[PDB]
Structure 1
């Protein structure tokens, strides 16, 4: 992920022009290769036409160039690219929203599962670790970065997501399916055992825990669904053919013909086809953005940081359920203990942001005295 929120906080002069200089995660990094191939092909063909064809062959080539340029506008490139890119961007944000975060579950585990002794610590750590293990199993199933970090369940055991006992249990349970759902059944059974043993004081708290864990299960299921049900191959194929056919045609149709022939549209020959190159930029960059976002769990620069998410989730969840359990800051009267209307101060930098409260759009409507009396 490349973050430029801080840069674009305000609408300054040339706000985006400044971002134009970024290289990492830039359109330049995606284009440069295809663009270099296109430029090489274009100039090879130009040199062929100028220095390797007879007069009759040059007449034939010029006829072909006028034909290609006249009929290129048939390809529905904007049509197909618009559809495809909208689908990919919608799916991309959905995929992000389905990334599971233990935070809600971890607060509820830290609260409800009771005991400062070894058994209480072990139970809390085990429940939150089951949540993290479920998440990491689905992530290594759908994400190339995570898979390269944990190319096997033995790697999961060596990295402390999974104990050797859990590894043996998973091996015993093995079906010909992705076993990412197992930790959720383990969580349900361990929560029930905790409640029966009096560590969870009430079935309403047990239900709360199970609801949070089941929300995580639904998110993991959505990740698996997006990973499995790709955007139809047929759509991908059609968009690829649209863009490539358009620019293969441009290789001939955007040749600068001999100015002598004075062909309409070829009066001026600039050796560099500026507008053809700009269209390459737009259309091929549009498709390459789609290529980069179609699987956000790849290793692109703008792909999600699944590895970081995994490490952060493990650290935060273990801290929340172990060190932060019944470990609260001293509860003392606050700054505004007997101040009916607290007014926190503003710094010099933020003093201009002090606003009068918005009271509703109807506040400033003025009516006559006669307009206000109720009628019988």
Structure 2
């Protein structure tokens, strides 16, 4: 993930222009190879036309180049690229929204599951570990970085996501499908056992724990669905064919003919087709947005940092359910204990952001005495 939120906080002078000096997760990094191949092909065709072809062959090539210009339309390529990239970006954000975070669940497990003894600690840690294990199982199923980190369930055991007993149970339960759903059934059964054992005081609390767990299950299922149900290959092939056909036509149609024969639009002979290269940049970059975002769990620069999320979730969830259980700061009266209207101070840097309240769009309407009188 390339984060530039801080750089674009304000709409300053050339805010977006300063982002063109970035290499990591940039357009240049994405399309330099394709641009070099296109450049080599274009200049090979140019040299063949200018040196190898005879006069009659040169005239035939010039007619072919003039005929190619009529089939280069930007409206269809722009429309198909716009729709396809919009779908890819929508799916990309939906995929991010389905990354499971244990924060709601870990707050409920910290609160509800009682006991500061070893058994209560073990129960809370086991429940939150089941949540983390389900998340890491689906992530190593869908993310290449996580898979490279945990290429086998034995790696999960060595890393401490799974105990050897849990590994044995998963091997025993093995079916010919992905087994990422198992820790959620384990969580439900352990929560029920905790409630029957008196560690969860009320069934309303048990229902709340299960609702959080089921929300995480739904998120994991969505991740699996996005990994499995790709954007239809016909749509991807259509957009690829559109872009590549456009630039294969541009290889011949955008060749600078002899300025001696003053063909319309060929009176000036540049050596570098600036507009063709700009169009290459725009359209191939638009396609590379989709290329990078179509699977956001790969190892691209702008792909999700799944390994960081896995580590953070484990650390934070274990701290929440183990050391922060019934460990609250001393409850004392605050700064505004007898202040009816608290007014926190502003720093010198932030004094200009002190604003009067917005009281509604109708606040400043002025009416006469006659206009405000109720009628019978």
Query: What stretches of structure 1 of length at least 5 have no aligned partner?
Result: none
After superposition, the C-alpha distances for 1:181-217 in whole angstroms (9 at most, x for unaligned) are: 0000000000000000000000000000000000000
After superposition, the C-alpha distances for 1:262-284 in whole angstroms (9 at most, x for unaligned) are: 11000001100000000000000
After superposition, the C-alpha distances for 1:56-86 in whole angstroms (9 at most, x for unaligned) are: 0000000000000122228821121111101
- Judge conservation of contact 1:142–1:297 (CA < 8 Å) in 2: yes
Are positions 1:24 and 2:24 aligned together?
A: yes
Q: How many Å separate the matches in 1 of 2:273 and 2:150?
A: 48
After superposition, the C-alpha distances for 1:123-154 in whole angstroms (9 at most, x for unaligned) are: 00000000000000000011111111100000
**1:107–1:74 Cα change, 3 Å:** closer
**1:112–1:36 Cα change, 3 Å:** same
Aligned structure 1 segments of 4 or more residues deviating by more than 4 angstroms = none
TM-score (norm 1): 0.99
Partner residue of 1:225? 225
C-alpha displacement of 1:108: 0.3
Q: How many Å separate the matches in 2 of 1:19 and 1:260?
A: 43
Partner residue of 1:158? 158
After superposition, the C-alpha distances for 1:35-71 in whole angstroms (9 at most, x for unaligned) are: 0000000000000000111000000000000000122
**1:87–1:98 Cα change, 3 Å:** same
TM-score (norm 2): 0.99
Q: How many Å separate the matches in 1 of 2:359 and 2:75?
A: 54
CA RMSD in angstroms comes to 0.8
Question: Secondary structure of 1:366's match?
Answer: coil
Correspondence list, 1:283-362, <5 A: 283-362=283-362
- Judge conservation of contact 1:100–1:135 (CA < 8 Å) in 2: yes
Question: Secondary structure of 2:23's match?
Answer: coil
C-alpha displacement of 1:223: 0.4
- Judge conservation of contact 1:75–1:242 (CA < 8 Å) in 2: no
- Judge conservation of contact 1:125–1:318 (CA < 8 Å) in 2: yes
After superposition, the C-alpha distances for 1:300-351 in whole angstroms (9 at most, x for unaligned) are: 0000000000000000000000000000000000000000000000000000
